[PDB]
Write a protein that binds this ligand. Sequence first.
Ligand SMILES: [Cl-]
Ligand code: NA
Lengths: 34, 338
Amino acid sequence: RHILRFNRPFLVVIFSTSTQSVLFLGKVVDPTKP
Amino acid sequence: SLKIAPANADFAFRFYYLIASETPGKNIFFSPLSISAAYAMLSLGACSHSRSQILEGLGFNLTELSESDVHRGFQHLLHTLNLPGLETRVGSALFLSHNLKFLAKFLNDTMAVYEAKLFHTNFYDTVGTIQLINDHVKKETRGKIVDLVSELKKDVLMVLVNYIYFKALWEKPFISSRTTPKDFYVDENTTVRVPMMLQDQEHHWYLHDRYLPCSVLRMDYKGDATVFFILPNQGKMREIEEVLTPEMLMRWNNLLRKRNFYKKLELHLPKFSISGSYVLDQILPRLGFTDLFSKWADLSGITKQQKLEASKSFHKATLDVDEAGTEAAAATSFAIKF
Ligand SMILES: [Cl-]
Ligand code: NA
C-alpha cells in the first residue's frame, strides 16, 4: 500500500502552480525510445 | 493570468486525447502552453472570423472573455514564468522576409504582448533560413530541440516561433547510487530494461484512486512547479485517458492537498528520456482550426501587400527525468506563405 512502481506505462503532467498552467503533458509507453 | 487558465488546460487535454486516440501505444510528449501561446500570438495578425476562430479552437469563450483579456493574460503568464532550483524560459520570435512590408501594429503587438524578437531572413535561401531558425530554437532550448522546422516551402514570407525551456530540481531527489536496471513492462509481450531510481525514506503526496484504476503521485520541484505521475493499473491506460480532463486533474490536485495523503513511500521511478514530434497543420484542423488551415483564412493583419495563407506548423518536445530533477523543452513553429 505504501509503494509505487513506475514499471508500466504512465502519464506525466508538469504544472506551473504560480500560473495554473499545464507546461507539458505526455505518456511514457516505452522509456527506451528517446 | 488566471482568466486564461481554464481555456489553456482545456486545449491541453483535447490535444492529448486526439494524439492518444489516433496513435495509441506510442510515447507522447508536448507543451500545450507553447502551442497555445504561439497560436494566440499568430491571432494578432488574423482578422475578422479567423481571429475569433483561432481563439475558440484554443478553448477561449469569447462571450466570457474579451480578446484583450486573452492577450494580456498571456502577457502576464509569460512574464511570471520568466521571473527569477527552477529555470523556466519562454520566448517568441518572428523571422520576417527582407522584402515584405509588415504592418507595424502586428509587429508592435507581438513585441508588447509576447516579448517577440524580430529577425530578418532571405526566404529565397531555404537552406540558410532553416538553419537560422533551427539554430535559434536549439540555442534557446539548451540543445534539446533540434530541427524544429523540418520543411520550408519556397513562397514563405514569415515564420513564427516560440519555445519553452524548463529545468527544475526535485524537492525530494533520488540517491543515484541506488539506481539500478529493472524491467519495464511495455505491454503483455514486451519488456525493456531501464535504469530505475529508488527512494524510500521520504514522505510523498500520493493516492490510490478508489474510483479509477490508477494511482497518482505528485512530486514537487524547487520553485513553483509540480509534476503528476499517473500510474494506471496494468492494461488500464486507455480507461484513464478517457477521463483525463482539466476537471480530473483538479480533482486529483485537491485530494492531494489533504495531509491524509502525505505518507512515507517506496518509490521506483525510471531515469529516462522521451520526445514528441508533431505536424500541427495536419492535426489542428481536427481541434477547431479548419479555418486557419483553409483557403479562407484571413491573415490580412500581417501585411496588406500580399494575400497570406498558412503553410507548415511543427511542434517538438523532449522530457529528461533523472535523480536530481526534470528537464523539459519544446518549441512550436508556424510558417506563412503567399
Ligand atoms: Cl512551410
Ligand atoms: Na516547489
